[PDB]
Design an enzyme around this catalytic site. Sequence first.
Site, PDB file in Angstrom:
ATOM      1  N   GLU A  35       0.817  -1.210   0.000  1.00 22.18           N
ATOM      2  CA  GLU A  35       0.000   0.000   0.000  1.00 22.18           C
ATOM      3  C   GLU A  35       0.851   1.261   0.000  1.00 22.18           C
ATOM      4  O   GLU A  35       0.532   2.224  -0.702  1.00 22.18           O
ATOM      5  CB  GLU A  35      -0.937   0.002   1.209  1.00 22.18           C
ATOM      6  N   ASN A  46      -7.799   9.032  -5.485  1.00 23.85           N
ATOM      7  CA  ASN A  46      -8.644   8.051  -6.151  1.00 23.85           C
ATOM      8  C   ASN A  46      -9.486   8.730  -7.226  1.00 23.85           C
ATOM      9  O   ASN A  46      -9.720   9.941  -7.191  1.00 23.85           O
ATOM     10  CB  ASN A  46      -9.564   7.371  -5.137  1.00 23.85           C
ATOM     11  N   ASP A  48     -12.583   8.750  -7.761  1.00 27.25           N
ATOM     12  CA  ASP A  48     -13.823   9.358  -7.292  1.00 27.25           C
ATOM     13  C   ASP A  48     -13.607  10.660  -6.530  1.00 27.25           C
ATOM     14  O   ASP A  48     -14.588  11.251  -6.064  1.00 27.25           O
ATOM     15  CB  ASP A  48     -14.634   8.362  -6.448  1.00 27.25           C
ATOM     16  N   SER A  50     -11.839  10.991  -3.671  1.00 33.62           N
ATOM     17  CA  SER A  50     -11.292  10.695  -2.362  1.00 33.62           C
ATOM     18  C   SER A  50      -9.779  10.510  -2.459  1.00 33.62           C
ATOM     19  O   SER A  50      -9.195  10.470  -3.545  1.00 33.62           O
ATOM     20  CB  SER A  50     -11.944   9.438  -1.787  1.00 33.62           C
ATOM     21  N   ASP A  52      -6.353   8.369  -0.397  1.00 36.22           N
ATOM     22  CA  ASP A  52      -5.862   7.357   0.535  1.00 36.22           C
ATOM     23  C   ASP A  52      -4.637   7.886   1.274  1.00 36.22           C
ATOM     24  O   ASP A  52      -3.760   8.505   0.666  1.00 36.22           O
ATOM     25  CB  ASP A  52      -5.463   6.082  -0.212  1.00 36.22           C
ATOM     26  N   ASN A  59      -8.879   5.402   3.259  1.00 34.89           N
ATOM     27  CA  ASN A  59      -9.594   6.207   2.275  1.00 34.89           C
ATOM     28  C   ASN A  59     -10.523   7.213   2.951  1.00 34.89           C
ATOM     29  O   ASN A  59     -11.332   6.851   3.815  1.00 34.89           O
ATOM     30  CB  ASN A  59     -10.403   5.250   1.395  1.00 34.89           C
TER      31      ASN A  59
END
EC number: 3.2.1.17
Length: 129
Positions: A35, A46, A48, A50, A52, A59
């Site tokens: 990650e 991301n 959309d 958002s 992380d 998220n």
Amino acid sequence: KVFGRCELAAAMKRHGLDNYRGYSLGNWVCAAKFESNFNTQATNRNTDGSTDYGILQINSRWWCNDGRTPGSRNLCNIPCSALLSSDITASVNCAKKIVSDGNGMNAWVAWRNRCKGTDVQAWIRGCRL
Ligand SMILES: [Cl-]
Ligand SMILES: [Cl-]
Ligand code: NA
Ligand code: NA
Ligand code: NA
Ligand SMILES: [Ru+3]
Ligand SMILES: [Ru+3]
Ligand SMILES: [Ru+3]
């Protein structure tokens, strides 16, 4: 902070992740490796809108507030910046909530695709636990 492999394993164990919800320590180390490459400061946007955050790429759509993810939740009740600290407490405590929500570690795409079903114990080999 970029943790060493055994340093992060030891920190995660102190914070109660070893066997948490049945997931051995190596699963958590493997997830963090893929990650964030063990970098607490990692951030990734991301599609959309958002973002992380941190060693486990938590998220803002659901788990933390970053002030720029409209309609999102803050289920860990923290600013997303808290997930970037050299102290992993906030990331660990939030990860405990995520992994308890029903889908286990499948919440982490990199865990599903790169750790699940592998010999994850290799990630803690040689470490003084
Ligand atoms: Cl170093
Ligand atoms: Cl490594
Ligand atoms: Na533990
Ligand atoms: Na949010
Ligand atoms: Na032990
Ligand atoms: Ru280094
Ligand atoms: Ru080392
Ligand atoms: Ru390394």
